[PDB]
Design a protein around this ligand. Structure first.
Ligand SMILES: Nc1nc2c(ncn2[C@@H]2CN(C(=O)CCP(=O)(O)O)C[C@H]2OC[C@H](O)P(=O)(O)O)c(=O)[nH]1
Ligand SMILES: Nc1nc2c(ncn2[C@@H]2CN(C(=O)CCP(=O)(O)O)C[C@H]2OC[C@H](O)P(=O)(O)O)c(=O)[nH]1
Ligand SMILES: Nc1nc2c(ncn2[C@@H]2CN(C(=O)CCP(=O)(O)O)C[C@H]2OC[C@H](O)P(=O)(O)O)c(=O)[nH]1
Ligand SMILES: Nc1nc2c(ncn2[C@@H]2CN(C(=O)CCP(=O)(O)O)C[C@H]2OC[C@H](O)P(=O)(O)O)c(=O)[nH]1
Ligand SMILES: [Mg+2]
Ligand SMILES: [Mg+2]
Ligand SMILES: [Mg+2]
Ligand SMILES: [Mg+2]
Ligand SMILES: [Mg+2]
Ligand SMILES: [Mg+2]
Ligand SMILES: [Mg+2]
Ligand SMILES: [Mg+2]
Lengths: 208, 204, 197, 207
């Protein structure tokens, strides 16, 4: 089946789910408004992305690059599904991993010369304006990878977007601020499996 | 009304967004309830069940065949609670096929004095569970409760509602997650709607 | 053929305190014998062996209740995972039997059991199934005991070959208890007396 | 007080042919040493131990990259499962650091963020224990409320300076192991089991 896709499209008027339908951390009981993307649905979509990734990139050594901090959950789960494929199939390919954090200035990570001649998969939590990815791609290409692709859990529909589109997309979401599944608000809500929308009292509670 | 409400106009998801068995590729129309969503809802139901029933030995009764997946997953989440909490209760299990006649379980004297949890895939008219409940009460359980993954909004309902509900769904035929169409589609993780060519292929 | 993961007669098992155990069985178990996760790892490999050997024709998976139900559910979950992530897939239907089967005729029948001890139950079961004209019959058993009481029957797929010891857990019961336990374990003296029939 | 699951010096591990293994590592591994699922079962219990000791106050969970990233993700998943199914839970924030040779810390938030917090350092393996002593000495300059260390693996080795972590998955022989994000020259991180490398594998992937 097809490997390029705009992702699961979540509409502008998506109501999400009452928190009382799900198991939610107690300490965030009053801080969230709605569950927006259930953890399980993220897992289902990520399973299919892993297959799409192996189809496009499985022909040569893959370097999977995790963009910290918010990419870490998507990265771990995506790679677990890729590993499941590679131990149950006829063919497989080695995969190495690295981690970078952005200040854009690139923090941590291996020497980027280790990307040379490899199939590089950049893994991100969200594309909003896309400026971060564009600057990051422009960097990585200078090391002459055999290919560079971007997997992003979330892509926002926003008038501030520039036209950048990643190669693999989990969900295309409206222009709302979401948290959970490692996406934070002032470092909070990373310890939440679902993607959710913050309540005004949660926004006020954890404001810097 | 107390479960996850899926509306009549729910469009579901394109098959191409998910991992789908090849042999059902032409036979399904849409994914209706993704497997992971069933899991998330089932996690919360497990907790609801322990809260109401965990005071006394539980006998969990799986209604075959369609009940088997929900049953195994619900009980896994209940086990996960019980091995990570301060207190828990023994649970024993039995399996039946469907006085209403009950095929293949233990003597129903095993229910006497127990907290009995009946586990179904779906409630539609509600007659099956009404009839099964009428029989079960005669064995004097301590309590009897029903958990159903799905409940249909149907005008043919006799007004029976279960105690625990995963999803309230439209009056549409669904398959997947052990729900079949002529024994097919049980080997599918998601709840889905069958395509026209799918109906024709597997028609009995 | 694979004989399964061989568990030695002297296998010490694991201290219960190193694992998550349901509180209601804390005094009733002696040791963890096969951790639940190891069961999953082995079952994942068996699912692949099953699909390589049987995946050419429609499969009917037949669960032997009650004890086979956890192994059955997990094994079929791993086979479904294979079937939705490969080019090669085959329809599977399911049925249950407790110790009509028109569900079996002309299909590749996979019988799923918790444990083979003497093998007499399985030989009797196999004799019945053959009468429904299946295309193929194979048997997957989570556990096979090493025992001189055996009549020589060996399943096609085996998870673990274990000593002649009474085990519980992962749907293996003692007077219907311990089915609600993820690990395979050995029962304590307290447990044997408490749940004795 | 638990020394962890003790894996003895003579334990033979498991035939590779009994598990699902990526084919690109088929000749490169000798035996499966600790099956992925056993790691999961042990990690579940650790998460409960951690919540019992640390759950009274906001936890900052510190991942020591790269090798600790799998243990870290899984351990936090089990802690999240406790927190969404209990009445009692506490927030957790996270941070990631890399250590580079003594050692300096790379990446990370300002260590001031650790002041007054319950700090949980998550590591893949303790061998001599010098790395953890170093990281602890740094962390302790910022006066955390408490600091604890969870390590998946601890080696039995004469070279130990005597440091013992607070939570331990497995106590293993002095053998070089790979898998579950532990590497040999960056390979084998993409393997779910912990395994011992073959002589072939050592020669194939040698720097
Ligand atoms: N929790 C949340 N975070 C969001 C959201 N939209 C954007 N963002 C991002 C906020 N960001 C960060 O906090 C970066 C550091 P972190 O990964 O958490 O350690 C980056 C924003 O992501 C988009 C890219 O910057 P760009 O595409 O270049 O515009 C959102 O709806 N929820
Ligand atoms: N796959 C599907 N099955 C459905 C559907 N609605 C009803 N049913 C059920 C058809 N049924 C069976 O096939 C029973 C045997 P099985 O569980 O498959 O081994 C029973 C129906 O469930 C509802 C009860 O009968 P009742 O509440 O008394 O009306 C549906 O939308 N999809
Ligand atoms: N919990 C345990 N059960 C065991 C054990 N060894 C045998 N058995 C079996 C006892 N059995 C049952 O309880 C059958 C009913 P159930 O599946 O629990 O609904 C059958 C025994 O399995 C072996 C076959 O009989 P056979 O190969 O013909 O000798 C054991 O070490 N632990
Ligand atoms: N794959 C493996 N790695 C090992 C093993 N014993 C040690 N080590 C470690 C080698 N190390 C690294 O490769 C650090 C970089 P990374 O986390 O992989 O990005 C550090 C060693 O861990 C122990 C500490 O150094 P210390 O307690 O201070 O002696 C082993 O049996 N297998
Ligand atoms: Mg990001
Ligand atoms: Mg952020
Ligand atoms: Mg039913
Ligand atoms: Mg049916
Ligand atoms: Mg049996
Ligand atoms: Mg029995
Ligand atoms: Mg380390
Ligand atoms: Mg290393």
């Amino acid at each position: 089946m097809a490997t390029r896709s705009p992702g699961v499209v979540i509409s502008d008027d998506e109501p999400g789910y009452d928190l009382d339908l799900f198991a939610i951390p107690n300490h965030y009981a009053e801080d969230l408004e709605r569950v927006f993307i259930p953890h399980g649905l993220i897992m289902d979509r990520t399973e299919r992305l892993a297959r799409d990734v192996m189809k496009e990139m499985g022909g040569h050594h893959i370097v999977a690059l995790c963009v910290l901090k918010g990419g870490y959950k998507f990265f771990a789960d995506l790679l677990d599904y890729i590993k499941a494929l590679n131990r149950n199939s006829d063919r497989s390919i080695p995969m190495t991993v690295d981690f970078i954090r952005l200040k854009i200035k690139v923090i941590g990570g291996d020497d980027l010369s280790t990307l040379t001649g490899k199939n590089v998969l950049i893994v991100e939590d969200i594309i909003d304006t896309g400026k971060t990815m564009q600057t990051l791609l422009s960097l990585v290409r200078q090391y002459n990878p055999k290919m560079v692709k971007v997997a992003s859990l979330l892509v926002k529909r926003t008038p501030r977007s520039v036209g950048y589109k990643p190669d693999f997309v989990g969900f295309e979401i409206p222009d709302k601020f979401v948290v959970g599944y490692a996406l934070d608000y002032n470092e909070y809500f990373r310890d939440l499996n679902h993607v959710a929308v913050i309540s005004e009292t949660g926004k006020a509670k954890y404001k810097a």
